Design a binder for this molecule. Structure first.
Ligand SMILES: *Cc1cc(C*)cc(C*)c1
Length: 12
């Protein structure tokens, strides 16, 4: 969390 996967999921 608060990583590139978190921000990719938030964007998607
Ligand atoms: C703290 C944080 C930052 C991003 C880019 C995304 C998430 C889910 C949390």
């Amino acid at each position: 969390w608060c990583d590139a996967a978190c921000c990719a999921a938030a964007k998607a």
